[PDB]
Structure formats: structure tokens, C-alpha cells
Design an enzyme around this catalytic site. Sequence first.
Site, PDB file in Angstrom:
ATOM      1  CG  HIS A   6     -36.815 -36.480  47.226  1.00 61.85           C
ATOM      2  ND1 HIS A   6     -37.237 -35.810  46.098  1.00 61.85           N
ATOM      3  CD2 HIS A   6     -37.793 -36.312  48.150  1.00 61.85           C
ATOM      4  CE1 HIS A   6     -38.404 -35.235  46.338  1.00 61.85           C
ATOM      5  NE2 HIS A   6     -38.765 -35.525  47.576  1.00 61.85           N
TER       6      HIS A   6
HETATM    7  C1  LIG Z   1     -38.364 -33.495  58.985  1.00 68.89           C
HETATM    8  C2  LIG Z   1     -38.110 -34.612  57.993  1.00 68.89           C
HETATM    9  C3  LIG Z   1     -37.269 -34.437  56.917  1.00 68.89           C
HETATM   10  C4  LIG Z   1     -37.035 -35.459  55.975  1.00 68.89           C
HETATM   11  N1  LIG Z   1     -36.186 -35.226  54.935  1.00 68.89           N
HETATM   12  C5  LIG Z   1     -35.984 -36.185  54.074  1.00 68.89           C
HETATM   13  C6  LIG Z   1     -35.079 -35.940  52.924  1.00 68.89           C
HETATM   14  O1  LIG Z   1     -34.515 -34.886  52.715  1.00 68.89           O
HETATM   15  N2  LIG Z   1     -34.946 -37.015  52.090  1.00 68.89           N
HETATM   16  C7  LIG Z   1     -35.562 -38.272  52.227  1.00 68.89           C
HETATM   17  O2  LIG Z   1     -35.349 -39.132  51.376  1.00 68.89           O
HETATM   18  N3  LIG Z   1     -36.378 -38.469  53.292  1.00 68.89           N
HETATM   19  C8  LIG Z   1     -36.586 -37.499  54.155  1.00 68.89           C
HETATM   20  N4  LIG Z   1     -37.425 -37.712  55.209  1.00 68.89           N
HETATM   21  C9  LIG Z   1     -38.052 -39.057  55.339  1.00 68.89           C
HETATM   22  C10 LIG Z   1     -39.304 -39.254  54.497  1.00 68.89           C
HETATM   23  O3  LIG Z   1     -40.206 -38.226  54.868  1.00 68.89           O
HETATM   24  C11 LIG Z   1     -39.858 -40.665  54.754  1.00 68.89           C
HETATM   25  O4  LIG Z   1     -38.791 -41.607  54.611  1.00 68.89           O
HETATM   26  C12 LIG Z   1     -40.942 -41.056  53.742  1.00 68.89           C
HETATM   27  O5  LIG Z   1     -41.936 -40.040  53.707  1.00 68.89           O
HETATM   28  C13 LIG Z   1     -41.562 -42.379  54.162  1.00 68.89           C
HETATM   29  O6  LIG Z   1     -42.545 -42.704  53.185  1.00 68.89           O
HETATM   30  P1  LIG Z   1     -43.691 -43.793  53.584  1.00 68.89           P
HETATM   31  O7  LIG Z   1     -44.385 -44.097  52.295  1.00 68.89           O
HETATM   32  O8  LIG Z   1     -43.020 -44.772  54.472  1.00 68.89           O
HETATM   33  O9  LIG Z   1     -44.636 -42.924  54.586  1.00 68.89           O
HETATM   34  P2  LIG Z   1     -45.136 -41.388  54.581  1.00 68.89           P
HETATM   35  O10 LIG Z   1     -44.550 -40.678  53.415  1.00 68.89           O
HETATM   36  O11 LIG Z   1     -44.885 -40.965  55.986  1.00 68.89           O
HETATM   37  O12 LIG Z   1     -46.727 -41.634  54.397  1.00 68.89           O
HETATM   38  C14 LIG Z   1     -47.505 -42.270  55.409  1.00 68.89           C
HETATM   39  C15 LIG Z   1     -48.924 -41.694  55.370  1.00 68.89           C
HETATM   40  O13 LIG Z   1     -49.813 -42.542  56.127  1.00 68.89           O
HETATM   41  C16 LIG Z   1     -50.823 -41.769  56.722  1.00 68.89           C
HETATM   42  N5  LIG Z   1     -51.373 -42.607  57.756  1.00 68.89           N
HETATM   43  C17 LIG Z   1     -50.784 -43.002  58.925  1.00 68.89           C
HETATM   44  N6  LIG Z   1     -51.524 -43.804  59.640  1.00 68.89           N
HETATM   45  C18 LIG Z   1     -52.676 -43.949  58.898  1.00 68.89           C
HETATM   46  C19 LIG Z   1     -53.857 -44.689  59.085  1.00 68.89           C
HETATM   47  N7  LIG Z   1     -54.078 -45.461  60.158  1.00 68.89           N
HETATM   48  N8  LIG Z   1     -54.800 -44.604  58.133  1.00 68.89           N
HETATM   49  C20 LIG Z   1     -54.586 -43.857  57.056  1.00 68.89           C
HETATM   50  N9  LIG Z   1     -53.518 -43.129  56.772  1.00 68.89           N
HETATM   51  C21 LIG Z   1     -52.594 -43.217  57.726  1.00 68.89           C
HETATM   52  C22 LIG Z   1     -50.079 -40.498  57.120  1.00 68.89           C
HETATM   53  O14 LIG Z   1     -50.932 -39.408  57.306  1.00 68.89           O
HETATM   54  C23 LIG Z   1     -49.075 -40.277  55.965  1.00 68.89           C
HETATM   55  O15 LIG Z   1     -49.553 -39.394  54.949  1.00 68.89           O
HETATM   56  C24 LIG Z   1     -37.675 -36.716  56.133  1.00 68.89           C
HETATM   57  C25 LIG Z   1     -38.538 -36.887  57.233  1.00 68.89           C
HETATM   58  C26 LIG Z   1     -38.751 -35.874  58.144  1.00 68.89           C
HETATM   59  C27 LIG Z   1     -39.685 -36.117  59.294  1.00 68.89           C
END
Ligand SMILES: Cc1cc2nc3c(=O)[nH]c(=O)nc-3n(C[C@H](O)[C@H](O)[C@H](O)COP(=O)(O)OP(=O)(O)OC[C@H]3O[C@@H](n4cnc5c(N)ncnc54)[C@H](O)[C@@H]3O)c2cc1C
Lengths: 487, 489
Positions: free
Chosen positions: A460
Amino acid sequence: SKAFDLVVIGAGSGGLEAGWNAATLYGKRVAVVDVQTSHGPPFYAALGGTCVNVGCVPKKLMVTGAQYMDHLRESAGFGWEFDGSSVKANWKKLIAAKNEAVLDINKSYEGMFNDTEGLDFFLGWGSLESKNVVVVRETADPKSAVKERLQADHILLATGSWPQMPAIPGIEHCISSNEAFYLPEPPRRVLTVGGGFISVEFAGIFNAYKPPGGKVTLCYRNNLILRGFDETIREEVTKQLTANGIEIMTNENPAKVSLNTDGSKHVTFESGKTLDVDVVMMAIGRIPRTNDLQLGNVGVKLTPKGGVQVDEFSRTNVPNIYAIGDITDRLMLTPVAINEGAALVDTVFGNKPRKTDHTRVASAVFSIPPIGTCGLIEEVAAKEFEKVAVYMSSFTPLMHNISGSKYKKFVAKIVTNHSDGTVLGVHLLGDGAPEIIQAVGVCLRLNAKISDFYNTIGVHPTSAEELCSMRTPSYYYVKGEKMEKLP
Amino acid sequence: HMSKAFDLVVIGAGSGGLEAGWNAATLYGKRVAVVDVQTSHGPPFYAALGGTCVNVGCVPKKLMVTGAQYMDHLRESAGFGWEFDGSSVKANWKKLIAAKNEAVLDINKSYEGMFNDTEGLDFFLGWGSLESKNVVVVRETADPKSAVKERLQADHILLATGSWPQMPAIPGIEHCISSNEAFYLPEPPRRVLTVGGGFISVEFAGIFNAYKPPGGKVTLCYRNNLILRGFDETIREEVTKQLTANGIEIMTNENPAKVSLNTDGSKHVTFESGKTLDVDVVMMAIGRIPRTNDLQLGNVGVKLTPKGGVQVDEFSRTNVPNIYAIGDITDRLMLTPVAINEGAALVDTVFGNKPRKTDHTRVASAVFSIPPIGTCGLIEEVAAKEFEKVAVYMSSFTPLMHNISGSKYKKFVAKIVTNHSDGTVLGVHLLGDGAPEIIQAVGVCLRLNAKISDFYNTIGVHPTSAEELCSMRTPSYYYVKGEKMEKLP
Ligand SMILES: Cc1cc2nc3c(=O)[nH]c(=O)nc-3n(C[C@H](O)[C@H](O)[C@H](O)COP(=O)(O)OP(=O)(O)OC[C@H]3O[C@@H](n4cnc5c(N)ncnc54)[C@H](O)[C@@H]3O)c2cc1C
Ligand SMILES: Cc1cc2nc3c(=O)[nH]c(=O)nc-3n(C[C@H](O)[C@H](O)[C@H](O)COP(=O)(O)OP(=O)(O)OC[C@H]3O[C@@H](n4cnc5c(N)ncnc54)[C@H](O)[C@@H]3O)c2cc1C
Ligand SMILES: CC(=O)N1CCC(C(N)=O)CC1
Ligand SMILES: [Br-]
Ligand SMILES: [Br-]
Ligand SMILES: [Br-]
Ligand SMILES: [Br-]
């Protein structure tokens, strides 16, 4: 007179693979015949074959060139600014770069012959004099001067195919793809005749390099272009070619062509319609190249359609004479011809018979945007299987909502035997589709099921991850009839 | 005002949390609440409804890399006969950022409408933390003394708060930014230093290089000798060369010691070596750490690992029976499709009577460098530690079209790593145009335990880069009990 284990008529995709493998893998003495050492007029194909000289290799370069028409326009949505009125497409520069790349390949094959033991190249026209004698003459005329007489334990027919030209008044005022590769100027108005991949690909090429005020028209005698490909994709590529300014005339067929006083061509269709163009390119088909081989001297049997008849191991009815590639009138693809040549030599000169698998062969169309496909389309599957499911995804990618080419829907379809989930075919339309499809061809050799795709984690963001996100069929075929739900 | 009760409360409406919540509500008829801090992208909190990938991650960065690729396309078009006024070319960063912002906001609004519409799937705005085993509190800020907006009773609690940029403790760190701020810069920097050797630093270096104003310069620094640790070593070396060839300066074995402001307001970076560099922006991309601090995990005793992620078993369970964790908070593979897979598996296990665990091996992934990387499976030095005999098949060359485009430095690399004892493919590593698209179906192949002969028996699609994967029959070299050698002994 000279003595050889194998004589190959045609230094093309399949013939070179067979000859090189025979000499270097099995230590055999090999002679290979072709009619020209480098590309272009008068004979067009040459050492290296059709793909190298007037086929896949140069057309892919020219399609790449045509894609910049889209890239320059689409860059604006991402913030690129420049003087659009200064843009021009130099066809002469394109053809010159293409010519240099092909000639480089010609020369490298020359050095391959010079450098390889037991692998000799002979210039001229080969034909069968007797069961174990290949004769090489100066021209295609069977009464022209004899240059060589080659005794052979084994003979391989690998002369490829040639453009088919319909028997209409004025056909002599039309060209084929052979001549399209060498046009001095990009045609301002051009008609490409035929619904197949060559007509579609050249339509895209001419569309990008046409001078101001130009127009590309493609005509096809039936209702929908690109017969044999997925129907959803046939409709969508029709729509996307039209969106980029190409006029698609379906249910139309030229009845005659005449010369205008300014040098252009006046085309009259069977319907009575008329069209004036600078160039008429016939791309209605390609036929096996058998007429100069004098197969009657030895009795090699042809099929009703004109191919050399072969069994699964590429053997003709005459012992020790074989045929591979486009001359067998089967799958006309370069990697298939290569595979057939290698299997043939492994069988004849090695300890293990090998036959080419002509199912589940991945292939592509370098239309703009392009197609990648492997395996069965759904209506062929529905005749072979009681229950077929079709999984479908079709949308404009986010980047083309920003680029402004909102017509560029990506299409991904998976066709399965619904009785056990086995993937029967995968069909793609959109940027990257030829590259995405290659490893899908490997999947189909591991009896991949739809669940094997959906349980794989996606990469992705890509277009390809769509293939791993489809869980629920869009519709079905039951006993051959299309329906949205199962009964 | 009364507290509300749910089968499942999800803290974090990101990649993994939204998958788990939607699947629980629509597939199994459960009552679900999801908590996030912001309804759309950008400052102050950057991530928002939809998660890090949607708001300040994969989705916007891929649009920006696509924009950056046009610098190459415009130059490369001349070899194919395209002519235009080169002096008139300008890269408008403000238009790129405005287009990106509108795209991301459209996704924000669609997620907002999903919650407003869908039965049993509710969204709550604020900061979630754990009060007790079955109560999530939602407060106005990350401060646990801030006002309580809601109390959500929960039979099951999912921690899915993601990660956050790590900032080194050097003097002048307040003059530096992270990738979060990079997505909102008003103007493109004339001179920029990206600090880090990982994929975010490399990707942003490419973006800034294309949109830099006339006379600008992008510098990337990395504290060790070779960028992109964890990727194939041939590819690490080639990416370095091809970034250099497009005008990016790569300072390896270098690391900022302090940052100060010059009198004109630019940043004066002093490295540990004593080298100095003046830039307009310093972007730190040295790593990302799991977001656990604000959850008040001490209230219920959820164990963290030494490294700092929430400890989980193979089924995403914490040491507290009904509390689970997925995604970047577990500090493992930080990828959006892994978080999604973990969330779907968890919900199938807990509510679906079909237990399932995520496979963290053979995950395909990409780097959208220019040109890009696509990879799946083991690198050869890792495989050589696990298998007695390892074979490496390798093709590397400049494709014909880049001999015409003039970008002759753009070598395409394809490598297949095998267990030579039985031919099983352990990893595939690609560098070049199309590599992220080519590698996807390779992941399906590896999950089906493909061998090198399955690749070689497959007929190529011609002409493509991908067909190189189906044309390799003889190893380029081997590893025998860990030792590299051209031939078997
Ligand atoms: C610059 C960049 C580029 C990337 N490019 C890629 C790519 O090309 N391909 C890929 O596979 N991955 C990529 N990633 C990684 C990807 O973004 C993460 O692996 C993925 O989003 C993690 O998903 P998650 O469900 O762990 O958390 P997230 O998608 O980070 O969701 C966590 C959410 O929790 C919320 N939150 C935090 N603390 C609290 C709280 N106390 N109360 C309520 N809400 C809270 C936040 O606001 C956020 O919306 C990239 C990351 C970055 C930083
Ligand atoms: C415009 C175009 C585009 C194509 N694009 C693609 C593509 O993208 N992908 C793909 O897979 N395929 C493509 N093809 C098809 C591909 O070119 C053929 O399938 C392939 O070249 C056939 O290989 P072959 O070994 O049968 O013969 P060829 O490669 O055709 O070689 C036959 C050779 O025989 C020589 N010859 C003929 N008669 C004699 C004689 N009497 N004596 C001596 N020598 C003789 C000819 O000069 C020629 O060099 C394309 C074809 C065309 C026309
Ligand atoms: C030109 C065409 O009709 N094709 C569709 C079917 C393909 C196949 N593998 O049979 C080959 C390409
Ligand atoms: Br027709
Ligand atoms: Br039809
Ligand atoms: Br700007
Ligand atoms: Br093999």
C-alpha cells in the site's frame, strides 16, 4: 556443401533460442539462416526476428514515447507549470533513437555468432530441397542462384508470420505495421484497420505524434474491438481511447481505396461511408510465413488455416523436421516461441522430453492505458465449468482525479472455478498492468485460489493490492448463463 | 448524562482500528465505539479520523512522490522527441499541497459519513485512556486532569493508537521538524537536511529535490555507513548512487550534534564530526515510537516490552484478558496492511468463532524512492544464518528505455534468494520503475511456497522489467554455512 546437426530457417525469437541452446548446452553443430543482417526495408524482419526488428522492442519504445503526451498534460495537476504552446512531438527524433537501439541489437547478435562455437549464420532464403538438405538462395525466387547447400540431421522451421492484406481494390495504396516503423513523417490523418492489439497500439502511437489538426481513426468490422480479451476491459479501453481523441468506427470495413491528387487516400467502406486520410495501415491479422519454404518438395503438412501442423513436441509429419513459433499459427508471442525452441532442443538432443504449456500464458497490450492478462476470460470459463465466479473492481485512482484524466478507470477482474475457488484468469486495465500480471502467471502454476490472493497482505498504496482485496463475487455463470446471484 | 455501553471500544480510528471496528459491527452485529482526537487532517494533532496513513502517511506521501516524479518525466521526454521551453518549467509546491489537502479531506469526510450512517458503529471525539478493565474515559486533552467528555463501558478494549516521530535530545532541537510538519510547509525549502537513513527520510529527500526552488540543494545525512538498513544490500548501494545522480547529497557516518539560528534566521547545523551545514529546514526522520504514554496503562497493568511497545501474544492479546493491541503500538512491522490484517484477524477470533493469527513473515512492502523499491521476504545475509545453503539469482542492468531517456544511472535490480537445498524462494528484492506493483503478486507466490523452478517455468510477459524474474535459472553466487562464494565447493 556443409554438414550440421541442426539447421534453423529463421533467426528469430524461437530460432535463436533453439540454435544457441543446441550449440552451447549440447555441443551440437548448428546453422541458422535469415534473409537480412539488420532491420528495415526491403525485408523488414532480420537477424533477431520480428520482435527485435519490427515488433515488441521498437513498438514498446514508441509507446513509451507516446505516453509523454499524457505525462506533460497530467503534471499540471501536481503543480508543474511550463509553456504548453511550445510543446511539439518530434517523430523523426523518435524514429532515429528507435533505429539506433534496434541496430545495436542486430550487431550484438552478429558478435554472438562470431563468438560461439558450433553456431554459424548464413545470409539468404532457405527452403527444403529434400528431407535432410536445406538450400539457401539469393532471393525468395526458387530459381535464383544457390548460395549454400546444408545437409542436416534435423531441420527447424522458424520463419514467423507476415501481415495479412485483404483482397480489395486499391490494397496496394495501404501499408502494414512494417512500413509504419519507417514513415518519414508522422501522418496527420491516419486510419488503422483492425480490432487487434497491433491496430490499437499504433492508434495510440500516431495519436500522440500527430501534427496540429490531426486525427487518428480506428475501424473494426465487428461491434467491439480486442476480441479474445476480457469484455469489461474491451468496453473500457474503447472509452478511454475515445477520451484521448481517437475515433473508434465499429461495424465498418474498407471496401476499396483510391489515390487522391494530393497523395492522400480515399477510403470507401462497405456501408457507403467515405474517409480521406494520409495513411491507411492494415492490421487485420498475421499469417504463417510458409510460401517460400517449398514444403511440397518434402510433403510437410499444413493445417486448413495455413500453419505448419505440429504435435505437442513441435514435430511435423516428416521425421526430423520441426516447427515452432508463429509459423505454427497458435499463440503468436515471443516468449512462447522461445519456450518452444528450448523445449524442442531439450527433447531432441537431451535426455528429457519437454513440451510447452500453452495455457495460463501471461501477456499484455501496450495500449494507453495498457492491459495485462493471464488465463481464461469468463465466457470461455463458463463453457468449461458449471459454476464460475467473477470478482470485479473498477474505479479511477486518486492520482488521476488530481491529474485530470478522470476517465482512467483501473479495472481488475479475477475469474474462478467457484466449486473450489481455483483462479482461472486475471485481467487488468490501467497504468502498470503488464508489470503487475507477470507474477500472477506464477500464481496460476501453484493452483492459487481466490482465498490465497485475499489472505496475502497488500502493498500500500498500489493498484496491484486491489487483487488481494476481493472477497465477494460480483456475479456468476451457472451452466453457462450469467446471473447476479446463485440458484 | 449517562455513560454508554459497547461490546468493543477502539482507541484510535486508524488503519487497524477502523478495520476491527467496521468488521465487528457489520459482520458480527456487535456494538462498537471508536475514539480519535481530530476529525480531519493537519495541525494541531496531524493524525486524525482515518489514521496516520490517510492523514500524514502513505496516502499523501505517495501523491507527493508522484508529483516529484514529473521532474524526471519532463527531462526524460526529450530523448523520445519531445520539445518544449525548458526555461519556463516551474514546480509549484503550493498547488501540490493544496491538491493533497483536498484529497485527504475528502477521505476524512467519507469516514465521518460512515460513522454517521452505520448501525452499531459510533465515533467519539477526544483522548481515550483506560480507567479500569471495562471503562474507557474520553477527555478533552492528553492531560489526564482535563475534563471528561464521555465514559465508554466495554466488554473488550482494542488499543490502536499508532506511533509518533522520535526527536533526538540535542541542543536546538526546537528549530527542527518531523514528517508531520513537512506535509504543511508553506513554501518548498531552498536548502533542506533530512536526518535518517530509513524510508521516510529517503522518500522526502526525493520530494524536496523535485520541488526545490532554483539554486536549491537537498542533503540527507545518516549516522552509519549505508542507508536503508534492513533492505537488500545491492539495492541499498544502488539507491544511494541513483539519489546522488539526481542531485541529492548523501552524508553518511554523520549525525547532528546541535542546531542554532544564524542572524538571517536559517539553521546552522553542527555535526558530531565538526562539519557544518546551513539549511532552511531540518527534518528529523530517525525513527517512530509507539504512542502509549497517554493511555494511562498503569491503571490496569498492561505490560509494555523493554523497547516500549504493548506486549502481545500471536492473537494480539495483552496480559489483561479482554484488552488487545494491534498496529504500530506493538512496535513490530509498522505498515498499514499489517495493522488492517491484525484487526480483521482479532475480530474473527473474538466475535467470529474462527480463530486466526496474522502471518508477519513474507510481507511485501515498498519504498517510494525515485526510482522505487519492492521487496518481499528475507535478505540474503539473514537467510544465510538460517539455512545451510543459500542461492542468489541476480539481474542488474540499465533498461533500454533509459538508455534513450538519458537516465543511464537507472539500473533495474532483480534478486531472488533461495534455500538451495530444495529451491524454496526465501525473498525477492526489486529496484526500479514499477517495483512496488510487480512485488504484490510475488507475495502471493511466497505464501504458496513457490520454488525457483515455478518462477522459471512461467512464460514471461515481453517487454517488461518483471519478466526478469521468470528468466533466471542459474545462481549468481551462494552462501554455504554462512560463507559467500561464486561456486559450490
Ligand atoms: C510519513 C509516513 C509514510 C508512511 N508510508 C507508508 C506506506 O507507504 N505504506 C505503509 O504500509 N505504511 C506506511 N506508513 C505507516 C502507516 O502509516 C502505519 O503503519 C499505520 O498507519 C499504522 O496503523 P495503526 O492502526 O497502527 O495506527 P494509525 O493509522 O497511526 O492510527 C492511530 C490513530 O490513533 C489516534 N490516537 C492516538 N492516541 C489517541 C488517544 N489517546 N485517543 C484517541 N485517539 C488516539 C491518532 O490520532 C491516529 O489517528 C507511513 C507512515 C509515515 C509516518
Ligand atoms: C508490430 C508487432 C508487435 C508485437 N509485439 C509483441 C509484444 O509486445 N510481445 C510479444 O510477445 N510478441 C509481440 N509480437 C509478436 C512477436 O514478434 C512474434 O510472436 C515472434 O517474433 C515470433 O517468433 P518466431 O521465432 O516465430 O519468428 P520471428 O521472430 O518472426 O523470426 C522469423 C525470421 O525468419 C526470417 N525468415 C523468414 N522467411 C525466411 C526464409 N525463407 N529464409 C530465411 N529466413 C527467413 C525473417 O526474416 C525473420 O527474421 C509482435 C508482433 C508485431 C508484428
Ligand atoms: C491477441 C489476443 O487475442 N490475445 C488474447 C489471448 C491471449 C492468450 N494467452 O491466448 C493472447 C493475446
Ligand atoms: Br477489421
Ligand atoms: Br465483437
Ligand atoms: Br511554490
Ligand atoms: Br529451474
